[PDB]
Design an enzyme around this catalytic site. Structure first.
Site, PDB file in Angstrom:
ATOM      1  N   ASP A 123       0.910  -1.200   0.000  1.00  0.00           N
ATOM      2  CA  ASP A 123       0.000   0.000   0.000  1.00  0.00           C
ATOM      3  C   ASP A 123       0.931   1.228   0.000  1.00  0.00           C
ATOM      4  OD1 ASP A 123      -0.876   1.765   2.697  1.00  0.00           O
ATOM      5  OD2 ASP A 123      -0.099  -0.185   3.331  1.00  0.00           O
ATOM      6  N   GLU A 132      35.076   4.038   1.689  1.00  0.00           N
ATOM      7  CA  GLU A 132      35.703   4.121   3.011  1.00  0.00           C
ATOM      8  C   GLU A 132      34.792   5.051   3.834  1.00  0.00           C
ATOM      9  OE1 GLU A 132      40.575   4.428   1.932  1.00  0.00           O
ATOM     10  OE2 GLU A 132      39.241   5.984   1.267  1.00  0.00           O
ATOM     11  N   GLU A 178      33.154   6.870   6.895  1.00  0.00           N
ATOM     12  CA  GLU A 178      33.495   7.260   8.261  1.00  0.00           C
ATOM     13  C   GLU A 178      32.259   7.657   9.067  1.00  0.00           C
ATOM     14  OE1 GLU A 178      37.962   8.999   7.349  1.00  0.00           O
ATOM     15  OE2 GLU A 178      36.143  10.177   6.917  1.00  0.00           O
ATOM     16  N   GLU A 215      39.236   7.818  14.148  1.00  0.00           N
ATOM     17  CA  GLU A 215      39.558   8.786  13.113  1.00  0.00           C
ATOM     18  C   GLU A 215      40.095  10.072  13.718  1.00  0.00           C
ATOM     19  OE1 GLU A 215      39.876  10.138  10.069  1.00  0.00           O
ATOM     20  OE2 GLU A 215      40.066   8.146   9.152  1.00  0.00           O
ATOM     21  N   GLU A 234      36.188   4.557  12.216  1.00  0.00           N
ATOM     22  CA  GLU A 234      36.096   3.968  10.891  1.00  0.00           C
ATOM     23  C   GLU A 234      36.367   2.479  10.859  1.00  0.00           C
ATOM     24  OE1 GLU A 234      38.422   5.983   7.795  1.00  0.00           O
ATOM     25  OE2 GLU A 234      37.924   4.344   6.438  1.00  0.00           O
ATOM     26  N   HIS A 282      35.375   8.099   0.764  1.00  0.00           N
ATOM     27  CA  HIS A 282      36.207   7.976  -0.427  1.00  0.00           C
ATOM     28  C   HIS A 282      35.731   6.739  -1.185  1.00  0.00           C
ATOM     29  CE1 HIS A 282      39.814   9.782   2.058  1.00  0.00           C
ATOM     30  NE2 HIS A 282      38.895  10.696   1.780  1.00  0.00           N
ATOM     31  N   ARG A 316      47.070  16.217  -1.966  1.00  0.00           N
ATOM     32  CA  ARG A 316      45.854  15.953  -1.207  1.00  0.00           C
ATOM     33  C   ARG A 316      44.717  16.929  -1.456  1.00  0.00           C
ATOM     34  NH1 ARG A 316      46.689  11.713   1.869  1.00  0.00           N
ATOM     35  NH2 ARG A 316      48.375  11.334   0.348  1.00  0.00           N
ATOM     36  N   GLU A 353      40.824   6.757  -6.593  1.00  0.00           N
ATOM     37  CA  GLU A 353      40.045   7.018  -5.378  1.00  0.00           C
ATOM     38  C   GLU A 353      39.377   8.380  -5.478  1.00  0.00           C
ATOM     39  OE1 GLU A 353      41.861   8.277  -1.736  1.00  0.00           O
ATOM     40  OE2 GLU A 353      40.838   6.788  -0.531  1.00  0.00           O
ATOM     41  N   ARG A 357      37.668  11.051  -3.802  1.00  0.00           N
ATOM     42  CA  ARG A 357      37.585  11.415  -2.391  1.00  0.00           C
ATOM     43  C   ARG A 357      36.418  12.330  -1.945  1.00  0.00           C
ATOM     44  NH1 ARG A 357      42.744  10.697   0.485  1.00  0.00           N
ATOM     45  NH2 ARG A 357      42.129  12.435   1.862  1.00  0.00           N
TER      46      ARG A 357
HETATM   47  N1  LIG Z   1      40.427  -2.874  -7.765  1.00  0.00           N
HETATM   48  C1  LIG Z   1      40.776  -2.898  -6.587  1.00  0.00           C
HETATM   49  N2  LIG Z   1      41.833  -3.636  -6.194  1.00  0.00           N
HETATM   50  C2  LIG Z   1      42.182  -3.647  -4.885  1.00  0.00           C
HETATM   51  N3  LIG Z   1      41.582  -2.982  -3.830  1.00  0.00           N
HETATM   52  C3  LIG Z   1      40.459  -2.222  -4.269  1.00  0.00           C
HETATM   53  C4  LIG Z   1      40.026  -2.150  -5.655  1.00  0.00           C
HETATM   54  N4  LIG Z   1      38.925  -1.349  -5.862  1.00  0.00           N
HETATM   55  C5  LIG Z   1      38.680  -0.928  -4.623  1.00  0.00           C
HETATM   56  N5  LIG Z   1      39.535  -1.386  -3.521  1.00  0.00           N
HETATM   57  C6  LIG Z   1      39.323  -0.937  -1.888  1.00  0.00           C
HETATM   58  O1  LIG Z   1      40.154   0.177  -1.289  1.00  0.00           O
HETATM   59  C7  LIG Z   1      39.586   0.206   0.137  1.00  0.00           C
HETATM   60  C8  LIG Z   1      40.348   0.548   1.345  1.00  0.00           C
HETATM   61  O2  LIG Z   1      41.018   1.686   1.845  1.00  0.00           O
HETATM   62  P1  LIG Z   1      41.720   2.160   3.215  1.00  0.00           P
HETATM   63  O3  LIG Z   1      42.877   3.006   2.683  1.00  0.00           O
HETATM   64  O4  LIG Z   1      42.264   0.922   4.002  1.00  0.00           O
HETATM   65  O5  LIG Z   1      40.702   3.087   4.177  1.00  0.00           O
HETATM   66  P2  LIG Z   1      40.957   4.247   5.360  1.00  0.00           P
HETATM   67  O6  LIG Z   1      42.544   4.707   5.066  1.00  0.00           O
HETATM   68  O7  LIG Z   1      40.077   5.440   4.899  1.00  0.00           O
HETATM   69  O8  LIG Z   1      40.750   3.770   6.735  1.00  0.00           O
HETATM   70  C9  LIG Z   1      39.229  -1.178   0.417  1.00  0.00           C
HETATM   71  O9  LIG Z   1      37.826  -1.195   0.651  1.00  0.00           O
HETATM   72  C10 LIG Z   1      39.847  -1.885  -0.813  1.00  0.00           C
HETATM   73  O10 LIG Z   1      39.514  -3.240  -0.789  1.00  0.00           O
HETATM   74 MN   LIG Z   2      41.008   6.916   1.628  1.00  0.00          MN
HETATM   75 MN   LIG Z   3      39.501   7.735   6.958  1.00  0.00          MN
HETATM   76 TL   LIG Z   4       0.491   2.792   5.326  1.00  0.00          TL
HETATM   77 TL   LIG Z   5      42.440   9.747   8.313  1.00  0.00          TL
HETATM   78 TL   LIG Z   6      37.629  12.383   7.259  1.00  0.00          TL
END
Ligand SMILES: Nc1ncnc2c1ncn2[C@@H]1O[C@H](COP(=O)(O)OP(=O)(O)O)[C@@H](O)[C@H]1O
Ligand SMILES: [Mn+2]
Ligand SMILES: [Mn+2]
Ligand SMILES: [Tl+]
Ligand SMILES: [Tl+]
Ligand SMILES: [Tl+]
Ligand SMILES: Nc1ncnc2c1ncn2[C@@H]1O[C@H](COP(=O)(O)OP(=O)(O)O)[C@@H](O)[C@H]1O
Ligand SMILES: Nc1ncnc2c1ncn2[C@@H]1O[C@H](COP(=O)(O)OP(=O)(O)O)[C@@H](O)[C@H]1O
Ligand SMILES: [Mn+2]
Ligand SMILES: [Mn+2]
Ligand SMILES: [Mn+2]
Ligand SMILES: [Mn+2]
Ligand SMILES: [Tl+]
Ligand SMILES: [Tl+]
Ligand SMILES: [Tl+]
Ligand SMILES: [Tl+]
Lengths: 468, 468, 468
Positions: free
Chosen positions: B50, B129, B131, B212, B220, B269, B339, B357, B359
């Site tokens: 519904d 990633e 947070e 974090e 995280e 990210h 960065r 990545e 971001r």
């Molecule tokens: N093609 C790929 N090959 C390898 N890792 C990958 C690929 N595509 C995405 N990833 C992902 O990058 C992510 C991790 O990042 P990380 O730097 O450890 O996080 P944080 O530094 O923000 O705590 C993971 O989820 C990882 O598995």
């Molecule tokens: Mn990152």
């Molecule tokens: Mn982080």
């Molecule tokens: Tl409803």
């Molecule tokens: Tl960080």
């Molecule tokens: Tl952050």
């Protein structure tokens, strides 16, 4: 090591691995990885980060570094709820895998290497005596309208008048009197022993435990010496156990050098000696059983004391402990008896145990950088046969101006210690142990901390100047 | 699948089945059905509603839609008191059973199909990633007489002065300092690990966990990548576990991009790469190991960034994070080190792991719509060989106006992102993935949220203008 | 003037002289000088300052400027305890004594001069209708942990339920209902009349006073028009009397455009007309009795509206009033009846009183800069015969999209008004009235205010996104 670590994972049904390391200021850091992420790969090339996120290591462009697990450091965390294994790491530069210039642990290792390289000895022995305080409540703050700090503990002499909800029991250590009264005056027997049992479960060897001089919970757990770098590791484990056992008992521990004006500060005397093929290079025919090698070591420490201060007494608070007291180890001289002397020579039976005790360090010091600096200074004393002059067995400056008593002293402020380190940096750069950037980075971090204290109005300034 | 699901019902003596799906804004929804209502029928034609009762799906006449259980998503709920099995569903139009234009999950699936249809690759890999923050108390409100928000947590640096009933223990992360101090400064080790264990019990694979940068509980949990749609499912499961484990521990978690001014915001990210027959289409001879295919992907993301913002940064709050900071990823450029660059190129060993990545996304983003939009933009970059220009390895706009530094940037407000999405909509409509009504419906929902914020007087406006 | 002023000093046994002027943002400033410091000298060359201390006037090197008393503005302060005479001043550059580029009063005078120089007319007439609010309590704040604003007044409809210590009397204006109920519903009759008596004792001429539409104390005192610069002076005196009489009665007044969401905002409609040799250049044979000269004036205002907004609606709060309401004057069109029209043409008997009413300005506007900008825009409309198109007598955009109703509108945000002013600056620079630095300085001040609002999390964002 690697092979052994994979064993501990199954023996303890480990669910997580806690990767630990130390920042420039000396604070242990960590990141957790599930046990299943540990493999062959991991040990040979580690796992890396988004590091641009740490202090004094922050480079705008080149933000990525490598965490290299040291398989020898594996130990179970006694606090975490899920079985987790702690593994201390080294920070290495990617690709090169050489060892970051700003990594305090790498720096300590380089200094141990350099000892061997010069052939002066093969191992450095360190025995710090770090002291601390256990409180019940700590409050503080600073804003545009004011600042404040309020310390409170069941042992605080000021509580002799406090109303408690089940009645004030009244057995507490007076100012400078917490030394050795038996319980109930000493309220921390059970607390200290727990800390000892846990420290031992984490690889440390405990020699003794006791309450210290100050009221409001000063305490101490004496652990056995060890090789320089391993000992700095132990200091980090020591602080961890103290902080967490305290927490687990409803207390809060601090390693600040001087939390209270009017009572004892906390110091971290450093007993040291060098060795080669199982022989103590510090026993000899000279003063109090010392070898001439030991005297040159001393000479080095005295020559570079103010620079060493920047590492052994890295806080503005440190200088509130190193204040012209009579017991305060501020005079740059050596003696077996005199307590004004910042370097005590333990009068001891066996030549096997001969050494020196540098008394001015405090627990706020980064164990790695502080220990390394002490060594490098001692080695520069040896390489250059720096005679430490004559011992100061007479009596302290309270034996005021006799010739104004122009005996060398430790830095009187952080700004001054930082200055000394800036100028007197060569002895540290020896063997490429400390790099200029590493040193400048450190000086800058501490310089901004010094600013906060120098720039913020102090409560006492109102007592002194409000009616000006 | 169907056959397997009937097994789990008996293996776990399941009493209920929780049908879950995601609304346009990205919030997981649910309705519970007794286990006995699950049968042959149910899997082939689902159960309907519904519905006229949901947001952005509300058509006055045609209110009825079908819930199609996806048997592959079956997983036990770890919180509910009575054994219940969760089954993610797709929203299909009745009779046709084709897949609702406004169903975010269907949209993500269409985008995965379209990837294969163009033959550019067979699978899309996503690694967000996300947070978050863990607080103890959150209060807020808005009425004719005013508005307010009050955040509070045991880790909040502002509590250094707070009186607690058992004493203030005082070990807490300062502003921007919660990074990696070990416990007791980091008060969430046990909390994070529980989240990890549960996430894994729900099909996710955890790579790491850590505190974090921000004070007051930023944390995280890094999970392993996966195919696009499956990963967006995982994000919903991730948020569920975080929200509920937090709750179960007496905390409250939020995925808001910027709860506090003056400290880190929470981002999400997005690591991405394409593949064909087990080969990483992103490794090549070009910049930092990238294939030219990867560069066109980047070009696409940069061209359609502002439109992507409407999905990756769907809240007005998102724009308080994406603020000219130095670390704030607002510049539409790529780099392996810089960065300021909203697209980091992970410098990595194996070609198998080469990727990009993006971001700028935050956790408020509907994972399905955000992920799909990222892809569709990248594909439009490839289909049209959009060169991403040259990398920005130099240094951010804090390297102020050098040519005014007229580098492309992300949307500066939601109104602007919504605008961009309105105009720059073609790349999304490709392959009939996103329909006009789907897009217009979304824009309208968010537009009314933007209104509330633009129309309601802000506390700071009083600070600034009351004495005007 | 000088001669007259020395008289008032003795006639009122004046003890002090209060030198007043207005800063860039529009806030009246002051410095007090003992009556005995007033002499021949003072009037011909003024007295100077350590000015580097004001905002948007701050030049690191050249910090010194001159305060030039305008003897025609002399008036006794009705609040100060010791007899003191107020004298409005102009800020002149030293030596040259020409008149600071950034001095708002000098700028308004230059614009009056330029009117005469072009011979288009000899005098500009201004009649602002500034509205305000009278509260009993106003609280607000913003810190890392949150923000808040709490408004309270005896008339606030929300107090119908409040417990008062002598009993709740209960006669208060409901939301949007404070219009004209007689006392006790209107609690400000005595307050308003005091304001009128005092305003008149300060040179103003009061036409009427009444409660306004909003609950919680919106009020208004209508004063008679006057020449442009003199009127902006009167606005400053008006705000002074309102603020201080309110204070003296235990209230607090605000000229903020929109203190509350859901009820009327405060505006400052601006009635205007030009004249030459006592003839109203705005009466003619065209629309509603208007001359063609009046229409070109209108055309100018419509062309430069968004830029004028940066001065007439200088706060982010201003844009919460200028929100698609039905009564909200946001459409850039003219009409004698339509209220959606931001320019009303007063239907009036005598040709002597023909004029236009620009309804979008609010009281936060710097009267000098706002008035001057309105004029300069009107003159650019005349110099360039800009036809205002056809009148909009039909009905507002609530008469939604008929052609999407792409009628020109006022700026939708401050950032946008600032932008417009940046680009569309030429009409202001005419006659060297506004200089580039003057304009850029203004834009920068307001830009930092806009930042605070754009960067600080808003309470409503939690209502909307905390559970994201
Ligand atoms: N093609 C790929 N090959 C390898 N890792 C990958 C690929 N595509 C995405 N990833 C992902 O990058 C992510 C991790 O990042 P990380 O730097 O450890 O996080 P944080 O530094 O923000 O705590 C993971 O989820 C990882 O598995
Ligand atoms: Mn990152
Ligand atoms: Mn982080
Ligand atoms: Tl409803
Ligand atoms: Tl960080
Ligand atoms: Tl952050
Ligand atoms: N070379 C050495 N030989 C023997 N003991 C050493 C040597 N180098 C350092 N030590 C260390 O001296 C330290 C202990 O001092 P202690 O006087 O018991 O502390 P406290 O009096 O401050 O409670 C121990 O850690 C001890 O093992
Ligand atoms: N040229 C002009 N001729 C006559 N009145 C003018 C002229 N220019 C401006 N005015 C001003 O119009 C203003 C008044 O408006 P009013 O409708 O009474 O305010 P409110 O309805 O908002 O309470 C007065 O300040 C009036 O003197
Ligand atoms: Mn001791
Ligand atoms: Mn000792
Ligand atoms: Mn009015
Ligand atoms: Mn009006
Ligand atoms: Tl002692
Ligand atoms: Tl001590
Ligand atoms: Tl009105
Ligand atoms: Tl109004």
């Amino acid at each position: 090591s690697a092979e052994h670590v994979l064993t501990m994972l199954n023996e303890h049904e480990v669910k997580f691995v806690d990767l630990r390391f130390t920042d420039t200021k000396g604070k242990e850091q960590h990141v957790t990885i599930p046990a299943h992420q540990v493999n062959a790969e991991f040990f040979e090339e580690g796992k890396m980060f988004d590091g641009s996120s740490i202090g004094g290591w922050k480079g705008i462009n080149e933000s990525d570094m490598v965490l290299m697990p040291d398989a020898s450091t594996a130990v179970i965390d006694p606090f975490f709820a899920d079985s987790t294994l702690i593994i201390r790491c080294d920070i290495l530069e990617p690709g090169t895998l050489q060892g970051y210039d700003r990594d305090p642990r790498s720096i300590a290792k380089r200094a141990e290497d350099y000892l061997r390289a010069t052939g002066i000895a093969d191992t450095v022995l360190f025995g710090p005596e770090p002291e601390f305080f256990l409180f019940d409540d700590i409050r503080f703050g600073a804003s545009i309208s004011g600042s404040h700090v309020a310390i409170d503990d069941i042992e605080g002499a000021w509580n002799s008048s406090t109303k408690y909800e089940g009645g004030n029991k009244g057995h507490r250590p007076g100012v400078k009197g917490g030394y050795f009264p038996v319980p109930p005056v000493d309220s921390a027997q059970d607390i200290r022993s727990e800390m000892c049992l846990v420290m031992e479960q984490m690889g440390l060897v405990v020699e003794a435990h006791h309450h210290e001089v100050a009221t409001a919970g000063q305490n101490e757990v004496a652990t056995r010496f060890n090789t320089m770098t391993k000992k700095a590791d132990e200091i980090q484990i020591y602080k961890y156990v103290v902080h967490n056992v305290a927490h687990r008992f409803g207390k809060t521990a601090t390693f600040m050098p001087k939390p209270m004006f009017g009572d004892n500060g906390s110091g971290m005397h450093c007993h040291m000696s060098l060795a080669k093929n199982g022989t103590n290079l510090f026993s000899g025919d000279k003063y109090a059983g010392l070898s001439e090698q030991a005297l040159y070591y001393i000479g080095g420490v005295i020559k570079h004391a103010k620079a060493i201060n920047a590492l052994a007494n890295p806080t503005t608070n440190s200088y509130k402990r190193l204040v012209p007291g009579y017991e305060a180890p501020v005079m740059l001289a050596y003696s077996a008896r005199n307590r004004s002397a910042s370097i005590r020579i333990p009068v001891v039976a066996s030549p096997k145990a001969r050494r020196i005790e540098v008394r001015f360090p405090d627990p706020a010091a980064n164990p790695y950088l502080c220990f390394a600096a002490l060594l490098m200074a001692g080695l520069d004393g040896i390489k250059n046969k720096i005679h430490p002059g004559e011992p100061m067995d007479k009596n302290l400056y309270d034996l005021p101006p006799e010739e104004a008593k122009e005996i060398p002293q430790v830095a009187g402020s952080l700004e001054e210690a930082l200055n000394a380190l800036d100028l007197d940096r060569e002895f540290l750069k020896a063997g490429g142990v400390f790099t200029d950037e590493a040193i400048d980075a450190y000086i800058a971090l501490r310089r901004e901390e010094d600013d906060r204290v120098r720039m913020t109005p102090h409560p006492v300034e109102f007592e002194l100047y409000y009616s000006v």
